[PDB]
Write a structure and sequence with these properties.
The structure is cut from a larger assembly and holds one copy of chain A, four copies of chain B, one copy of chain C, two copies of chain D and one copy of chain F.
Chain C: H1 2-18, H2 33-47, H3 63-72, E1 78-83, E2 89-93
Antiparallel strand pairs in C: 1-2
Helix pairs in contact in C: 2-3
Chain D: H1 9-27
Chain F: E1 10-13, E2 18-19, H1 22-35, H2 39-53
Classes of the chains: A alpha+beta, B alpha+beta, C alpha+beta, D mainly alpha, F mainly alpha.
The complex binds zinc ion (ZN).
C-alpha cells in the first residue's frame, strides 16, 4: 500500500516477446478501426516483411508518421511502480537492457 | 554502489529471480514474508 | 500450436509434482496469524464486490466485519496454499485449520 | 596541404557548442509550461530536482 | 535464414463435392486464461461465459484467424492438480491485490476462417461501376473491386453485364484476394481472375 | 474497450483446427442457438441467418 | 557527431596519389582528435567522472 | 491502484543484458541529429531532442 | 467506467441526485461486474498507521 499502491502504482504495457516496457506504443488506426498495443522492437517495417505465404490483416499496424509494421502483437499489461520505467529508461541510455519475463505466456 | 553491481549483473547475464524483499519492491511484487508467504485460492462449486 | 500443447503439459506436470497430497501434509494444523489476516482482508474484498455471502449480515456494513463473522462460523470458501522453500506446496482449506 | 586543411574536430566543436548553447538557452527563455493533471487529481510538476 | 514465417496458416481450406466451394468452417480447441469476477464465485462457468466467451461471438478473433461462431464444452482447469477432472468443486487462485480470480479454461471454438485462395459464393446486394457487393452465407461482407472483374465485363445504369452480354445476379462465385479484419466487421476482398 | 474483465489475458489453440461437415455445422448451430435463449441478442440473430443459409433458404 | 560526419566527408575526397607519407601522420592526427572528443562527449553523458 | 482493475499478467523474473545497435535502430521512433532544441516560436525543432 | 465525479463544486440537490444513482444496474456488459465506489471521509470504524 505504501511503497506501491499509494505512490507510483502504474498499469503499463509489456511485450511478452522481448520483455520490454519501453518499446510498446498504441497503434494509430484508420478511422473506424480500433487502436491496438504493439511492440516496436519485435515488429518488421512493412517493406522488409514483404521482401520475405500471405500476410494477414490483423498483423499490420501503423504509427502516426505513417510507417506500416508487421507483427509485435504479443503485449499485455502488468502493474509496476512508475519509477521502474525511469530506471529502465536510464539503463537503456547506458546501453543496458532489462528483460521482464511475464506469465502467462 | 548501484552502477558497480549493475555492471556486474550485466556481465554475468544475471537473472533476478525476484526473491529478496528489495528486488520485489523494485518490481512492485507482493513481499515474500508474512502475509505474502502463501497464496489464496477460492473454492468454487458448479465447475463441471 | 502443437507446441503450446506441449508447453501446457509441462506446466501442468510440474505443478502436480509440486503438490503435496492431503494425507502427506506436514505443516502446522493451526492457522497462522498471517494467514488469518490475509484471509479476512481478501474475503472482505470479495464481499465488497458482491460475492455471495454465507451468513446473516444483521446490520453490518463493514465488509471486514462480515468476513470475520464468516470466519467465526467457518463459512469462508478460501484455501491457503503454503509454499515450502523448494516451491512445493500444501493446500489447506480455511475451514479445516484451527483458528486462534 | 590537403590533409593538413582537414578540419580539426575539437576546435570546431568549441565554436559550435558555444552558438548552440546560446541558442538553446534563449529558446527556453520564453517557453510556456502547461499544467497536466492526472485522473488522480494530480498536477504534474516539471522539476528535475528531488531536493528532499 | 530467418523464420517469423511460423505464423502461416497450416490449415488449408479444402474444395468441396458435390459442390465447388471451399469449406471454411472449422473446429479448434483452445486454452484461455481469464478473469473471474467475485459476483460469479458460485457460478464460475456462467461467469466465464458472460465475461469472456459471449463477447467473442460473431466477431473476428486474431488468434483463431477467423470469425468465432460459437463454443462448446467449456471446462475450468482446477488449480488443484490433485483433483479428478470429474469433481464440481475447483480452485481458482485469487489475485494478491484484488478480489478477482484468474483461471485457465479449455473450450471448443467454431470458426469461419476464409484464408486467401479459397473459393466462396456470395449473394449480390449492390452493383456500382466501382465494385460488386456480396453477402457470404447471408452474413459476412464481400467486395470485388472494379479491376478484379475481368476486362471484357461491362457496366450499365446500375448493374453489371458479363463476357457474353448477359447480366449477373444472386449467387456469384469468387476467389479470396485478401481478408480485412480490423474494421467494425469482417470484410472479404474477392477476385474473378 | 478491452479490459481484463471482458477479454482473456491470452488465447492459444491447442490443436490444429479440424474441418466440420455441413451436417455438423447445423447440429452445432441448432444447440448453441437454443442454449442461448444486447450484443448476444443481435449475434444469435445473425447465427440464425447463417443456419438458414446452411439449410438453403433466402 | 555532425562535425565528424564532415571530417569523414573531406577524408573521402582525398586521392591517394596526392596523399603523402607525411599526410599519413596528419590524417591520423585528425582522426585521433575526432575519436577522443566524441568519446569524451559520450563519457560526459554516462559518467561525468 | 483500484480493486476493480485487476491485472492478469505477472512479471516473474528480470534478465540483465546489453542493447545491440541493431535492436535500437529497429525500435527507434526517430533518429536525432540536430543540436538545436527549439525554434524562434518555441516549437520543437524536427530531428532535434 | 472508472471515471471520477467530483462532489466539490456541488449543491445539495446535485449531490442528492448522484446519491440516488449509486446503485443503478449496468447499461454496459463490459463493466457489468463492477459497482460504483464512494470516496468517503475517514471515520471511527477506520484504522491508520
Ligand atoms: Zn517486443
Amino acid at each position: 500500500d505504501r511503497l506501491l499502491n499509494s505512490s507510483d502504482y502504474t498499469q503499463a504495457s509489456v511485450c511478452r516477446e522481448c520483455g520490454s516496457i519501453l518499446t510498446t506504443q498504441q497503434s494509430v488506426p484508420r478511422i473506424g478501426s480500433i487502436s491496438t498495443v504493439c511492440c516496436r522492437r519485435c515488429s518488421m517495417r512493412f517493406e522488409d516483411a514483404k521482401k520475405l505465404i500471405f500476410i494477414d490483416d490483423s498483423q499490420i499496424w501503423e504509427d502516426g508518421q505513417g510507417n506500416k509494421f508487421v507483427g509485435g502483437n504479443e503485449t499485455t499489461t502488468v502493474a509496476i511502480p512508475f519509477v521502474l520505467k525511469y530506471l529502465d529508461s536510464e539503463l537503456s541510455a547506458m546501453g543496458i537492457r532489462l528483460r521482464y519475463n511475464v506469465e502467462p505466456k | 554502489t548501484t552502477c558497480q553491481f549493475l555492471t556486474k549483473a550485466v556481465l554475468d547475464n544475471e537473472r533476478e529471480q525476484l526473491d529478496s524483499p528489495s528486488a520485489r519492491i523494485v518490481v512492485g511484487k507482493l513481499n515474500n514474508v508474512g502475509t505474502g508467504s502463501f497464496d489464496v485460492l477460492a473454492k468454487v462449486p458448479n465447475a463441471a | 500450436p502443437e507446441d503450446f500443447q506441449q508447453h501446457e503439459q509441462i506446466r501442468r506436470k510440474t505443478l502436480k509434482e509440486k503438490a503435496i497430497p492431503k494425507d502427506q501434509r506436514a505443516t502446522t494444523p493451526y492457522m497462522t496469524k498471517y494467514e488469518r489476516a490475509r484471509i479476512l482482508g481478501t474475503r472482505a474484498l470479495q464481499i465488497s464486490m458482491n460475492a455471495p455471502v454465507f451468513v446473516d449480515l444483521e446490520g453490518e456494513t463493514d465488509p471486514l466485519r462480515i468476513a470475520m463473522k464468516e470466519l467465526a462460523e467457518k463459512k469462508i470458501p478460501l484455501v491457503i496454499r503454503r509454499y515450502l522453500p523448494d516451491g512445493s506446496f500444501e493446500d489447506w482449506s480455511v475451514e479445516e485449520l484451527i483458528v486462534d | 596541404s590537403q590533409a593538413e586543411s582537414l578540419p580539426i574536430v575539437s576546435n570546431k566543436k568549441i565554436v559550435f557548442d558555444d552558438e548552440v548553447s546560446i541558442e538553446n538557452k534563449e529558446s527556453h527563455k520564453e517557453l510556456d509550461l502547461p499544467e497536466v493533471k492526472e485522473d488522480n487529481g494530480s498536477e504534474i510538476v516539471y522539476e528535475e530536482n528531488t531536493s528532499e | 535464414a530467418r523464420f517469423i514465417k511460423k505464423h502461416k496458416k497450416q490449415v488449408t481450406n479444402p474444395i468441396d463435392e458435390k459442390n465447388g466451394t471451399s469449406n471454411c468452417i472449422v473446429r479448434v480447441p483452445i486454452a484461455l486464461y481469464v478473469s473471474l469476477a467475485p459476483m460469479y464465485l458460485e457460478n464460475p462457468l456462467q461467469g466465464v461465459m458472460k465475461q469472456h466467451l459471449n463477447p467473442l461471438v460473431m466477431k473476428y478473433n486474431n488468434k483463431v484467424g477467423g470469425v468465432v461462431l460459437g463454443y462448446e464444452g467449456l471446462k475450468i482447469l482446477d488449480a488443484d492438480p490433485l483433483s479428478k477432472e470429474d469433481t464440481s468443486e475447483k480452485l481458482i487462485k485469487i489475485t494478491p491485490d484484488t478480489p478477482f480470480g484468474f483461471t485457465w479454461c479449455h473450450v471448443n471454438l467454431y470458426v469461419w476462417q476464409p484464408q486467401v485462395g479459397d473459393v466462396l459464393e456470395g449473394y449480390i446486394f449492390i452493383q456500382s461501376a466501382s465494385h460488386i457487393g456480396l453477402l457470404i452465407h447471408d452474413a459476412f461482407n464481400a467486395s470485388i473491386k472494379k479491376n478484379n472483374i475481368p476486362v471484357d465485363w461491362t457496366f450499365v445504369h446500375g448493374h453489371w453485364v458479363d463476357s457474353n452480354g448477359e447480366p449477373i445476379d444472386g449467387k456469384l462465385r469468387f476467389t479470396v484476394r485478401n481478408v480485412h479484419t480490423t474494421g467494425r466487421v469482417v470484410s472479404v476482398d474477392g477476385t474473378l481472375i | 474497450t478491452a479490459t481484463t474483465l471482458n477479454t482473456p489475458v491470452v488465447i492459444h489453440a491447442t490443436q490444429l483446427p479440424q474441418h466440420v461437415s455441413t451436417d455438423e455445422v447445423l447440429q452445432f448451430l441448432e444447440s448453441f442457438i437454443d442454449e442461448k435463449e444486447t450484443n448476444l441478442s443481435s449475434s444469435i440473430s445473425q447465427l440464425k441467418r447463417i443456419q438458414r443459409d446452411f439449410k438453403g433458404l433466402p | 557527431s555532425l562535425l565528424i560526419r564532415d571530417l569523414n566527408d573531406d577524408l573521402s575526397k582525398l586521392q591517394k596519389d596526392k596523399v603523402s607519407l607525411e599526410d599519413r601522420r596528419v590524417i591520423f592526427s585528425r582522426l585521433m582528435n575526432a575519436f577522443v572528443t566524441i568519446q569524451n562527449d559520450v563519457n560526459a553523458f554516462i559518467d561525468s567522472t | 491502484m483500484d480493486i476493480s482493475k485487476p491485472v492478469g499478467s505477472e512479471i516473474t523474473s528480470v534478465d540483465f543484458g546489453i542493447l545491440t545497435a541493431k535492436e535500437i535502430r529497429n525500435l527507434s521512433a526517430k533518429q536525432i541529429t540536430n543540436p538545436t532544441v527549439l525554434d524562434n516560436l518555441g516549437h520543437p525543432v524536427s530531428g532535434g531532442l | 467506467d472508472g471515471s471520477l465525479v467530483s462532489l466539490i463544486g456541488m449543491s445539495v440537490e446535485q449531490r442528492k441526485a448522484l446519491a440516488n444513482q449509486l446503485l443503478t444496474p449496468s447499461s454496459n456488459v463490459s463493466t457489468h461486474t463492477l459497482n460504483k465506489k464512494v470516496y468517503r471521509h475517514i471515520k471511527n470504524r477506520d484504522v491508520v498507521l
